[PDB]
Amino acid sequence: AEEQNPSATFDTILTLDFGSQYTHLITRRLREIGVYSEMLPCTQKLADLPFKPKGIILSGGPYSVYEDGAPHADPAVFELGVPVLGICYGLQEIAYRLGKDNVVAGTAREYGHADLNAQRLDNQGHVDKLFAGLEEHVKVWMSHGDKLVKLPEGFHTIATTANSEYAGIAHETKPVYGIQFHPEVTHTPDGAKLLRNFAVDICGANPNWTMSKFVDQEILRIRKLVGETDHVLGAVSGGVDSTVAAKLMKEAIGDRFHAVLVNNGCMRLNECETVAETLNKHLGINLTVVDASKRFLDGLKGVTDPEKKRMFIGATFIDVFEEEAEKIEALAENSGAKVKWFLQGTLYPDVIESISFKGPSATIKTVGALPKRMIEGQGMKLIEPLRELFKDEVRQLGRELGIAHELVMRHPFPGPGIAIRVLGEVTPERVDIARKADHIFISMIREAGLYDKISQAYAALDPSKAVGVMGDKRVYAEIIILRAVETTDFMTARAFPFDNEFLSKCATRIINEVHGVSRVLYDISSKPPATIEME
Amino acid sequence: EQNPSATFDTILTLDFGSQYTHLITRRLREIGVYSEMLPCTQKLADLPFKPKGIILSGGPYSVYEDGAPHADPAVFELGVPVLGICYGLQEIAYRLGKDNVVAGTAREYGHADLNAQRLDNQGHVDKLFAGLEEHVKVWMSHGDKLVKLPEGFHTIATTANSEYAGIAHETKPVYGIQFHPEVTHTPDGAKLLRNFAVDICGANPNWTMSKFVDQEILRIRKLVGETDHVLGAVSGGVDSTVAAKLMKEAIGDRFHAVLVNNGCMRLNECETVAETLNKHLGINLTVVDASKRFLDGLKGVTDPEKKRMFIGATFIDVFEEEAEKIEALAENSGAKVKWFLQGTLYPDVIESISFKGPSATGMKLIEPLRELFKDEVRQLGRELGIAHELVMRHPFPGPGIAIRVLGEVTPERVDIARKADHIFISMIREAGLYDKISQAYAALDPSKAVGVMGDKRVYAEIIILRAVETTDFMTARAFPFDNEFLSKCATRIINEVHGVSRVLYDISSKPPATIEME
């Protein structure tokens, strides 16, 4: 092909984001069932698309399509000739652009479960192809704020619930479909069948989007981009994302890709040596380990403000990385080549948050403090071989690259490491206490067979003083905070429902085996209210 | 004057340092026999009462080692029965056997299935195990096993691994057991302690709080007199309320109750406590609003120990200033407040007298509860007409929320902790769990954690939830909430209380950690 983009070589479904919190799930469902897909804000002018989508899905959003400033899509969505599916607010946009009459009932934006039945279209009982396999008793996550009291002009009913006579509508001749429920959330379990009925059966999309096929196509894409003599510089940290990206570059250019592992002194016990073993020996990546433990921990002394702490971690990491960068460039200069590309582990969810529709606000513009230092100042161009993949696709990509299935299932570990998991000032002793407390917590999770059921788990040190009974003297020591959640729909994570005997036995072991710990606390905050990490 | 040690048949337990010694006295109370405990160093000739019986507790020692603890040699010649428990069994074999019969093995503990020793050709057993004939689950102390019968003793109880798990003297009333009948691991231990107290010692099991009301009321009237005044602090807790109610039933308006609001009380509690004590219970009550005085002096104090020293110092300053305020009133014609009321319990006495090792190194006070346990004070309140809910509420510390704000205490951090506490306690009551929990509260943690306000990251403080179930005074575990309850309580606190980005639940037990935060 002339362009090796996934949207240029695969049948692509395009979702237009109208502001719903469930819009990214539409793309994720399509990726899981086999059809490649991308998402763009509703303000996207479809004439400027570098690819011709096989189908367009209009997502939902907290708006009423006939109010002032109500978001709309390009009028060319229906003039394009490809099938269109309107999800909730997309149903309102369909009635607005094609029916022209205000037929939406301005009910309050409330959601709830309902039983949906397909509409018999004949005396023989045929149903619309959008509900093939979803004929009777389908539990859906209805959006009552998008209810229609009348069929839009040129549309007929294909789905019906107890309260919504027009829960699903289809055009008489054009492939335009609309539904009042969200088929992308877990509250609609059979929704993945409906999204496949639209992509494959209605739009004719080929469900051949696999990591089995993408690994080879992406390696050719990297070799054609980088060339045959240029060198690539990247960063590694033992995490799943940085490991899959580094292994992908190694399989494309070999030793011409140089990975740099920076030790900020806040890694887990012997993590810097176990990661260097798997990268340099088990995977064959040309790795380089720089030990900046003293440089980080000395500047961390005194920084109590958590915002000022995160600034020092990023600023120092870049100064340390660019120093290892210039030293690697001098090694390549003695070889007859030069470093020209900087590896960045950007994922597709990272660009989703950058282009997600926030309503009648401002379209943001102008990529990271570390790549900025590599571009201007070092003269390197970015290379992001993961910017079109989700987290689960990266895990399957690493499995196709020969990486062990155990490593791709590891929990995410932040850049600053324990420095973020130490509330307030970060000292070597506070890191050592949090590291040993974390080792006990994760070990008991693994031995109990609960590691693959937790999205992320760690222990954090709290410098606040609580009291204990050391023999007979009253001792005041620091506090260990335990954190463990499970993600639901790549969001809405809730604290893992540990058995209460598991938490007590782990709290007793931590207080006994780790010094300077008087109390152990379990974080019960769920994700939508709070955050996953502590800082 | 006439302490309960003289008016009742009281079993005296001698403490050899075991963590279970206090349970011996507690079991004796719950079966109707009054009891007191004293360290093993107590000379019995200096006792202010004649004990109906003596119990030798266990301890982390071996009797034939250097510096090993010993009781007064007069215990076996007092004329009353003696029951040696574990280490008390060793002391019996030492003073009455004169030979080293202890095994000296490791001080390990474990469950075992005990069986009484049949004595006759008719299936008779010693009446210490009456009702405990066969298959008695006991908490054995393997470090107290004997290899041979002490001189003058015979077997009355056996386990499969220990042929001398329970011994008894041939003629004298001296008994020994290799297990703890005071722990919950021996669910029939209360039956054994009743056989020793009532059947063997002959003690009258008439100790009730119903009979102790009028006795203690007359005891207070004689100590104070009929013209002196006494001062007392009230907090709304069950201990301060019963003591104040008891004092009012004794001397009436000559007792003055002072509710000091330190600015660290629960939401509107100062008024609800005032209406309860002044209107429902009819206690002469005055309210001192020292909120600004406490909170101003707590600023800039980060050390948790210096806080408690300031809280206790200004608390006393308020009472000393309130006493002279009452004496100066012309309505009280020359009345002198010569006594100060304190709600000290017997566990507070036990802490100061418990055996801890062989080294063993002004307004008048009135302590009417200095001989009772927690469950006996609640029943005493029931005898005084106090409502059943007012006697079943969790204890509230003197400093209140001041020790429930880790580090510096400010009016804002108290208000946040006060609001987070209301949601936690109310959800516990609505879930029907208030009576199944010994203590429950919410504490503020000044450590910062990231949160999401719309879509901008913010840094707020932390709320710490703490709820424990406790039976003994030195044993408690974090209450096993349903994780749906803790999750629904966490999201509700963050949404409804300002300045809270995280909600944590304390899962630290009492055998390692502590109830309160500071």
JSON list of C-alpha atoms in Angstrom, two decimals, chain A residues 306-307 310 423-424 458 462-469 471-472 474 476 479 481-483 494-501 503-504 507-508 511-512 518-526 528-535, chain B residues 304-305 308 356 406-407 441 445-452 455 457 459 462 464-466 477 479-484 486-487 489-491 494-495 501-509 511-518:
[
{"chain": "A", "resi": 306, "resn": "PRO", "atom": "CA", "xyz": [3.09, 17.16, 46.09]},
{"chain": "A", "resi": 307, "resn": "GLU", "atom": "CA", "xyz": [2.77, 19.42, 43.03]},
{"chain": "A", "resi": 310, "resn": "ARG", "atom": "CA", "xyz": [5.98, 15.87, 40.58]},
{"chain": "A", "resi": 423, "resn": "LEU", "atom": "CA", "xyz": [2.70, 11.17, 50.70]},
{"chain": "A", "resi": 424, "resn": "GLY", "atom": "CA", "xyz": [4.59, 14.41, 51.23]},
{"chain": "A", "resi": 458, "resn": "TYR", "atom": "CA", "xyz": [0.37, -1.08, 45.96]},
{"chain": "A", "resi": 462, "resn": "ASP", "atom": "CA", "xyz": [1.69, 8.08, 55.20]},
{"chain": "A", "resi": 463, "resn": "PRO", "atom": "CA", "xyz": [3.95, 10.39, 57.25]},
{"chain": "A", "resi": 464, "resn": "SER", "atom": "CA", "xyz": [1.09, 11.06, 59.69]},
{"chain": "A", "resi": 465, "resn": "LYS", "atom": "CA", "xyz": [1.71, 9.65, 63.16]},
{"chain": "A", "resi": 466, "resn": "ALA", "atom": "CA", "xyz": [-0.48, 7.02, 64.81]},
{"chain": "A", "resi": 467, "resn": "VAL", "atom": "CA", "xyz": [0.10, 5.27, 68.12]},
{"chain": "A", "resi": 468, "resn": "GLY", "atom": "CA", "xyz": [1.05, 1.68, 68.92]},
{"chain": "A", "resi": 469, "resn": "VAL", "atom": "CA", "xyz": [1.96, -0.42, 71.95]},
{"chain": "A", "resi": 471, "resn": "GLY", "atom": "CA", "xyz": [5.75, -3.77, 74.71]},
{"chain": "A", "resi": 472, "resn": "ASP", "atom": "CA", "xyz": [4.74, -1.17, 77.29]},
{"chain": "A", "resi": 474, "resn": "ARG", "atom": "CA", "xyz": [3.60, 4.25, 73.59]},
{"chain": "A", "resi": 476, "resn": "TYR", "atom": "CA", "xyz": [4.28, 6.89, 67.38]},
{"chain": "A", "resi": 479, "resn": "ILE", "atom": "CA", "xyz": [1.14, 4.72, 58.49]},
{"chain": "A", "resi": 481, "resn": "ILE", "atom": "CA", "xyz": [-1.99, 2.71, 53.15]},
{"chain": "A", "resi": 482, "resn": "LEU", "atom": "CA", "xyz": [-3.08, -0.28, 51.06]},
{"chain": "A", "resi": 483, "resn": "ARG", "atom": "CA", "xyz": [-4.63, 0.32, 47.64]},
{"chain": "A", "resi": 494, "resn": "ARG", "atom": "CA", "xyz": [-14.06, 0.15, 42.83]},
{"chain": "A", "resi": 495, "resn": "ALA", "atom": "CA", "xyz": [-11.95, -1.04, 45.75]},
{"chain": "A", "resi": 496, "resn": "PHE", "atom": "CA", "xyz": [-11.31, -4.76, 45.43]},
{"chain": "A", "resi": 497, "resn": "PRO", "atom": "CA", "xyz": [-13.73, -6.72, 47.68]},
{"chain": "A", "resi": 498, "resn": "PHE", "atom": "CA", "xyz": [-11.07, -8.49, 49.73]},
{"chain": "A", "resi": 499, "resn": "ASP", "atom": "CA", "xyz": [-12.20, -11.00, 52.31]},
{"chain": "A", "resi": 500, "resn": "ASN", "atom": "CA", "xyz": [-12.00, -9.27, 55.68]},
{"chain": "A", "resi": 501, "resn": "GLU", "atom": "CA", "xyz": [-9.69, -11.97, 57.06]},
{"chain": "A", "resi": 503, "resn": "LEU", "atom": "CA", "xyz": [-6.96, -7.58, 55.13]},
{"chain": "A", "resi": 504, "resn": "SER", "atom": "CA", "xyz": [-6.49, -8.24, 58.85]},
{"chain": "A", "resi": 507, "resn": "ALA", "atom": "CA", "xyz": [-2.25, -5.62, 58.21]},
{"chain": "A", "resi": 508, "resn": "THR", "atom": "CA", "xyz": [-0.84, -7.73, 61.04]},
{"chain": "A", "resi": 511, "resn": "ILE", "atom": "CA", "xyz": [2.99, -4.02, 61.30]},
{"chain": "A", "resi": 512, "resn": "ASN", "atom": "CA", "xyz": [5.05, -6.98, 62.53]},
{"chain": "A", "resi": 518, "resn": "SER", "atom": "CA", "xyz": [1.95, 1.69, 63.56]},
{"chain": "A", "resi": 519, "resn": "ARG", "atom": "CA", "xyz": [-1.24, 1.34, 61.47]},
{"chain": "A", "resi": 520, "resn": "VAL", "atom": "CA", "xyz": [-2.35, -0.18, 58.17]},
{"chain": "A", "resi": 521, "resn": "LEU", "atom": "CA", "xyz": [-5.23, 1.41, 56.25]},
{"chain": "A", "resi": 522, "resn": "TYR", "atom": "CA", "xyz": [-7.12, 0.07, 53.23]},
{"chain": "A", "resi": 523, "resn": "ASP", "atom": "CA", "xyz": [-8.29, 2.63, 50.68]},
{"chain": "A", "resi": 524, "resn": "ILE", "atom": "CA", "xyz": [-12.02, 2.18, 50.05]},
{"chain": "A", "resi": 525, "resn": "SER", "atom": "CA", "xyz": [-12.40, 5.12, 47.64]},
{"chain": "A", "resi": 526, "resn": "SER", "atom": "CA", "xyz": [-13.79, 4.16, 44.23]},
{"chain": "A", "resi": 528, "resn": "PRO", "atom": "CA", "xyz": [-15.25, 8.01, 39.82]},
{"chain": "A", "resi": 529, "resn": "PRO", "atom": "CA", "xyz": [-15.02, 10.00, 43.10]},
{"chain": "A", "resi": 530, "resn": "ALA", "atom": "CA", "xyz": [-11.27, 9.79, 43.78]},
{"chain": "A", "resi": 531, "resn": "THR", "atom": "CA", "xyz": [-8.15, 8.68, 41.87]},
{"chain": "A", "resi": 532, "resn": "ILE", "atom": "CA", "xyz": [-6.26, 5.41, 41.65]},
{"chain": "A", "resi": 533, "resn": "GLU", "atom": "CA", "xyz": [-2.83, 6.70, 42.70]},
{"chain": "A", "resi": 534, "resn": "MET", "atom": "CA", "xyz": [-2.20, 8.84, 45.78]},
{"chain": "A", "resi": 535, "resn": "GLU", "atom": "CA", "xyz": [-0.47, 11.78, 44.06]},
{"chain": "B", "resi": 304, "resn": "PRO", "atom": "CA", "xyz": [0.66, 14.36, 69.40]},
{"chain": "B", "resi": 305, "resn": "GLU", "atom": "CA", "xyz": [2.06, 14.09, 72.93]},
{"chain": "B", "resi": 308, "resn": "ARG", "atom": "CA", "xyz": [-2.62, 15.66, 75.07]},
{"chain": "B", "resi": 356, "resn": "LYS", "atom": "CA", "xyz": [4.92, -6.74, 84.74]},
{"chain": "B", "resi": 406, "resn": "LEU", "atom": "CA", "xyz": [-3.65, 13.63, 63.21]},
{"chain": "B", "resi": 407, "resn": "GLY", "atom": "CA", "xyz": [-1.15, 16.39, 63.89]},
{"chain": "B", "resi": 441, "resn": "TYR", "atom": "CA", "xyz": [-15.58, 7.27, 64.56]},
{"chain": "B", "resi": 445, "resn": "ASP", "atom": "CA", "xyz": [-5.57, 13.00, 58.00]},
{"chain": "B", "resi": 446, "resn": "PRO", "atom": "CA", "xyz": [-3.83, 16.22, 56.86]},
{"chain": "B", "resi": 447, "resn": "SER", "atom": "CA", "xyz": [-1.86, 14.29, 54.22]},
{"chain": "B", "resi": 448, "resn": "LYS", "atom": "CA", "xyz": [-2.84, 15.35, 50.71]},
{"chain": "B", "resi": 449, "resn": "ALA", "atom": "CA", "xyz": [-4.16, 13.12, 47.94]},
{"chain": "B", "resi": 450, "resn": "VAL", "atom": "CA", "xyz": [-5.21, 13.87, 44.37]},
{"chain": "B", "resi": 451, "resn": "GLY", "atom": "CA", "xyz": [-8.89, 14.21, 43.53]},
{"chain": "B", "resi": 452, "resn": "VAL", "atom": "CA", "xyz": [-11.07, 15.15, 40.58]},
{"chain": "B", "resi": 455, "resn": "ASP", "atom": "CA", "xyz": [-11.77, 17.47, 35.48]},
{"chain": "B", "resi": 457, "resn": "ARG", "atom": "CA", "xyz": [-6.85, 17.71, 39.77]},
{"chain": "B", "resi": 459, "resn": "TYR", "atom": "CA", "xyz": [-5.35, 18.14, 46.62]},
{"chain": "B", "resi": 462, "resn": "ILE", "atom": "CA", "xyz": [-7.91, 12.35, 54.04]},
{"chain": "B", "resi": 464, "resn": "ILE", "atom": "CA", "xyz": [-9.82, 7.71, 58.23]},
{"chain": "B", "resi": 465, "resn": "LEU", "atom": "CA", "xyz": [-12.67, 5.43, 59.31]},
{"chain": "B", "resi": 466, "resn": "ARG", "atom": "CA", "xyz": [-12.23, 3.31, 62.44]},
{"chain": "B", "resi": 477, "resn": "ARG", "atom": "CA", "xyz": [-10.53, -6.38, 65.83]},
{"chain": "B", "resi": 479, "resn": "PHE", "atom": "CA", "xyz": [-15.20, -4.63, 62.34]},
{"chain": "B", "resi": 480, "resn": "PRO", "atom": "CA", "xyz": [-15.79, -6.81, 59.22]},
{"chain": "B", "resi": 481, "resn": "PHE", "atom": "CA", "xyz": [-18.07, -4.50, 57.26]},
{"chain": "B", "resi": 482, "resn": "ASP", "atom": "CA", "xyz": [-19.65, -5.56, 54.01]},
{"chain": "B", "resi": 483, "resn": "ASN", "atom": "CA", "xyz": [-17.46, -4.08, 51.28]},
{"chain": "B", "resi": 484, "resn": "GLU", "atom": "CA", "xyz": [-20.62, -2.67, 49.68]},
{"chain": "B", "resi": 486, "resn": "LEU", "atom": "CA", "xyz": [-17.71, 0.70, 53.05]},
{"chain": "B", "resi": 487, "resn": "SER", "atom": "CA", "xyz": [-17.72, 1.61, 49.35]},
{"chain": "B", "resi": 489, "resn": "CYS", "atom": "CA", "xyz": [-19.93, 5.13, 52.73]},
{"chain": "B", "resi": 490, "resn": "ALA", "atom": "CA", "xyz": [-16.69, 6.24, 51.05]},
{"chain": "B", "resi": 491, "resn": "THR", "atom": "CA", "xyz": [-18.31, 7.79, 47.97]},
{"chain": "B", "resi": 494, "resn": "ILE", "atom": "CA", "xyz": [-16.33, 12.46, 49.58]},
{"chain": "B", "resi": 495, "resn": "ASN", "atom": "CA", "xyz": [-19.37, 13.94, 47.82]},
{"chain": "B", "resi": 501, "resn": "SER", "atom": "CA", "xyz": [-10.27, 13.52, 48.50]},
{"chain": "B", "resi": 502, "resn": "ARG", "atom": "CA", "xyz": [-9.77, 10.05, 50.05]},
{"chain": "B", "resi": 503, "resn": "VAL", "atom": "CA", "xyz": [-11.53, 7.80, 52.56]},
{"chain": "B", "resi": 504, "resn": "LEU", "atom": "CA", "xyz": [-9.52, 5.03, 54.24]},
{"chain": "B", "resi": 505, "resn": "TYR", "atom": "CA", "xyz": [-10.63, 2.29, 56.63]},
{"chain": "B", "resi": 506, "resn": "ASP", "atom": "CA", "xyz": [-8.40, 1.18, 59.50]},
{"chain": "B", "resi": 507, "resn": "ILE", "atom": "CA", "xyz": [-7.82, -2.59, 59.40]},
{"chain": "B", "resi": 508, "resn": "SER", "atom": "CA", "xyz": [-5.30, -2.75, 62.26]},
{"chain": "B", "resi": 509, "resn": "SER", "atom": "CA", "xyz": [-6.19, -5.04, 65.15]},
{"chain": "B", "resi": 511, "resn": "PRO", "atom": "CA", "xyz": [-3.24, -7.11, 69.63]},
{"chain": "B", "resi": 512, "resn": "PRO", "atom": "CA", "xyz": [-0.84, -5.12, 67.39]},
{"chain": "B", "resi": 513, "resn": "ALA", "atom": "CA", "xyz": [-2.26, -1.59, 67.28]},
{"chain": "B", "resi": 514, "resn": "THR", "atom": "CA", "xyz": [-4.61, 0.71, 69.23]},
{"chain": "B", "resi": 515, "resn": "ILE", "atom": "CA", "xyz": [-8.25, 1.81, 69.13]},
{"chain": "B", "resi": 516, "resn": "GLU", "atom": "CA", "xyz": [-7.94, 5.59, 68.86]},
{"chain": "B", "resi": 517, "resn": "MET", "atom": "CA", "xyz": [-5.49, 7.23, 66.46]},
{"chain": "B", "resi": 518, "resn": "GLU", "atom": "CA", "xyz": [-3.41, 9.18, 69.00]}
]
